[PDB]
């Protein structure tokens with residue numbers, strides 16, 4: 092019963108079948124679906140008449156090519172996961188349908204929140220994500236859109252985007268889903284070995300009780316577990332970080348006062 | 353009968369009060385209307401049930417400050433003109449309206465056609481225009497967009513923009529309106545002096561005979577008029593050129609065989 096639009100043409104026909112009198116939620120993803128994804132969907136299903144999920148791994152937002160090839164995909168499973176949530180439409184285009192001409196027109200952010208943290212760390216990542224998210228919104232024309240708090244600046248950036256471009260959509264920000272350790276669910280977590288999860292869980296032991304008072308000391312702890320701490324910083328009440336375990340790269344942010352978990 | 357909407361909110365309630373059975377044409381402009389502009393509008397009135405003209409001078413497209421200070425305002429004369437055309441809606445917003453938070457998000461082109469001609473001589477300009485046109489379209493949501501062939505690159509660029517961003521609007525291209533001399537109707541012309549105006553026509557009488565076989569010579573000819581030629585080239589079947597007369601900056605493009 093879930094419909095699958097494999098290309099834009101299919102999706103357009105579906106999309107122009109629905110009335111305006113009714114509510115369309117949209118959850119975009121790169122697939123390899125986990126409990127975090129699933130939470131956004133559920134919430135979408137609670138608030139809307141039609142739920143659209145897209146799965147596209149957008150090339151232009153990967154600054155790291157090996158990351159791009161390394162990126163997990165299991166579509167047949169994602170479809171099964173998606174159909175067991177009674178998702179109405181899976182939009183699953185190819186690069187060729189999103190970028191018929193290649194990437195010739197791009198959103199380039201100039202803001203402070205764009206030059207820090209994830210923005211400094213992955214150059215061009217934000218441009219790419221902003222370009223695809225604009226295109227996805229234009230295609231899906233949703234009433235409601237669901238985003239994880241996990242990628243915080245992503246949310247800010249998309250909030251500005253829909254404002255600046257006069258896109259009529261509510262943005263709902265969903266809380267980050269975590270493991271008991273406090274470790275946030277991530278698709279790239281599939282790529283980490285048993286040895287790494289050990290480290291990862293160690294890191295979160297450290298984070299779970301720590302002051303955040305002294306940041307240089309914490310880096311030292313985290314770097315000692317074998318992961319490479321990339322950035323860690325305080326903004327308002329909130330801590331942000333990124334780090335590598337092996338070749339797998341993970342980000343997190345949470346309220347300083349409460350978290351992770 | 354013409355609604356003048358000086359802000360987005362006013363404009364929205366107007367935009368969304370309209371039926372699907374009505375076709376909306378849009379003619380974006382920077383104001384200071386001349387017959388070039390009119391020609392576009394006369395063509396929109398003919399193909400549409402509702403015509404929307406906008407006047408916004410977009411700061412973001414200007415790569416020269418004095419060009420921006422220079423840029424001609426006749427707002428009241430423009431309202432008049434737009435009224436004797438029986439234009440339905442005049443949308444003329446302010447900067448706060450269009451860039452509520454400043455200019456944070458930009459359309460940036462990477463293609464050759466944005467790296468040549470007007471693109472070299474006006475850095476930042478194409479990104480500026482693309483951003484405003486995107487906003488303008490996202491706001492007006494029209495069926496038909498009317499653009500002049502005079503800004504050729506821009507036309508090409510807006511054609512890309514529309515296709516890349518999945519906006520359903522037809523692009524309709526309209527022929528350059530000219531003075532008898534062949535000089536293209538232009539807003540900045542209202543800045544030419546009476547003698548500068550005669551220099552323009554000299555330049556165009558020179559263009560009216562050239563086989564365009566030697567451009568350095570055509571160049572020296574143009575420059576001997578007092579003008580300062582910025583560039584001239586053939587790409588495909590056409591000439592593109594731009595030049596200065598004093599402070600005023602003008603451009604053209606046409607088939608090798610400006611009538």
Ligand SMILES: Nc1ncnc2c1ncn2[C@@H]1O[C@H](COP(=O)(O)OP(=O)(O)NP(=O)(O)O)[C@@H](O)[C@H]1O
Nearest residue numbers: 120121127238239241242266267268275276277278
């Ligand atoms: N643990 C999570 N809790 C809540 N939302 C999440 C979580 N993880 C991801 N999301 C959101 O799901 C959407 C898709 O994430 P996704 O695009 O698939 O790529 P990613 O962030 O680079 N790798 P991943 O960690 O799986 O998201 C985004 O809005 C994410 O913020």
Ligand SMILES: Nc1ncnc2c1ncn2[C@@H]1O[C@H](COP(=O)(O)OP(=O)(O)NP(=O)(O)O)[C@@H](O)[C@H]1O
Nearest residue numbers: 381382388499500503527528529536537538539540
């Ligand atoms: N002489 C002309 N003939 C036909 N169309 C024109 C002419 N001049 C301008 N237009 C078009 O009218 C629309 C608005 O132009 P405009 O906003 O005034 O920017 P512009 O290129 O600086 N125009 P201008 O300064 O008047 O030459 C654009 O699509 C133009 O290409």
Ligand code: PRO
Nearest residue numbers: 119120149220223224
């Ligand atoms: O462009 C993307 O892929 C990001 C990921 C979550 C939704 N938006």
Ligand code: PRO
Nearest residue numbers: 380381382410481484
């Ligand atoms: O209106 C504008 O912003 C310019 C001139 C017409 C098309 N682009």
Ligand SMILES: [Mg+2]
Nearest residue numbers: 121122123278
């Ligand atoms: Mg994913």
